Amino acid sequence: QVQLQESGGGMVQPGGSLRLSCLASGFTFSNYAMTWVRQAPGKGPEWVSMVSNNGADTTYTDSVKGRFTISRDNAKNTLYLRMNNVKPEDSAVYYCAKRRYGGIWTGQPTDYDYLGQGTVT
Amino acid sequence: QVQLQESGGGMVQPGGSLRLSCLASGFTFSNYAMTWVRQAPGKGPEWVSMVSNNGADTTYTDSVKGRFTISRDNAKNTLYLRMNNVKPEDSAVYYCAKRRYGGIWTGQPTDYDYLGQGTVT
Amino acid sequence: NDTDVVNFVSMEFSLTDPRLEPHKWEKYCVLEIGDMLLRSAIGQMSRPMFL
RNA sequence: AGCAAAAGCAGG
């Protein structure tokens, strides 16, 4: 069945790096686009990044360009996110989710599935 | 008695940061200059930085300029070193030591005291 | 002479609106230059920008 | 217009 278990998070220092991994199982992975969506304690969630099926069309938020790099590996059906130059405001709980459609821009960023975990710095 | 116990090290990813602390006890701290010296496994040690008694005169190796920041606190008689932009080759065992004299340039960098720990990335 | 005045014009950007304290400046000449999208802990502020 | 003051600038 469809489940998304993420890991790789932890404590870091400001201006460092982190490599978040997301393992998905239960569905056809190569068909659907993926999204990272974070939520800070107190504020409603905000989408972090949206990545395509081919891994060629990628989109980030207006405040994280140049600092982040989203990617995916279709062999192990897994999702990678490289966060560099961690600002203090990126301190939130990160979420890995599987888009409704196989697209990125068709429709506003909203998801219809479960979640794993996310660390804070 | 004179003892130098350091900590703060660990695993990091390339391009990250690290904050090494060194607590010294048994002598007059504010009088003697201090040194950070690292050693890669296989190669003899190499001096990383030399810091004054006033905390105003600091000097680093020719390959770590701009990336490191050495400092000291006379209250707890302790020595701090902040490393940013960790290169893969800076992966070595770090050493905290207390200079023969209270100076930095008078005499070549060599020490006469004990050691703590140092981590590797 | 060194005592002499030199006059000029000065442009320094500003977020906070006027008319909250119009007494503070009887001298400024405030323009509008649109929005700057500040990021707070929740949402986005999108306050205007004056000069 | 402004600066700043019990007098001057704002070119010669």
Considering only CA atoms, which residue is closest to the C1' of nucleotide D8?
C4
CA angle centred on A88, ends A83 and A93, rounded to 5°: 65
Which 3-62 residues of chain A touch chain C by CB within 8 A? Answer: 40, 42-44, 62
Identify the residue whose tokens are 């989408």.
A47
Identify the residue whose tokens are 């000069």.
C51
| CA A102/CA A51 separation, integer angstroms | 10
B17:A13 CB<8 A: yes
Q: How was this structure determined?
A: cryo-EM
Read out DSSP for A12-58? --TT-EEEEEEEEESS-GGGS-EEEEEE-TTS--EEEEEE-SSS--E
The candidate with the shortest Cα–Cα distance to A102, out of A49, A11, A35, A47, is A35
| CA B89/CA B83 separation, integer angstroms | 13
| CA B96/CA B24 separation, integer angstroms | 9
| B102 CB-contact burial (10 Å; exposed 0-12 / middle 13-18 / buried 19+) | middle
Identify the residue whose tokens are 């469809």.
A2
- Domain coordinates in residue numbering, chain B: 1-121
| CA A9/CA A47 separation, integer angstroms | 18
A89:C39 CB<8 A: yes
3-state secondary structure of C37: coil
The full length of chain A comes to 121
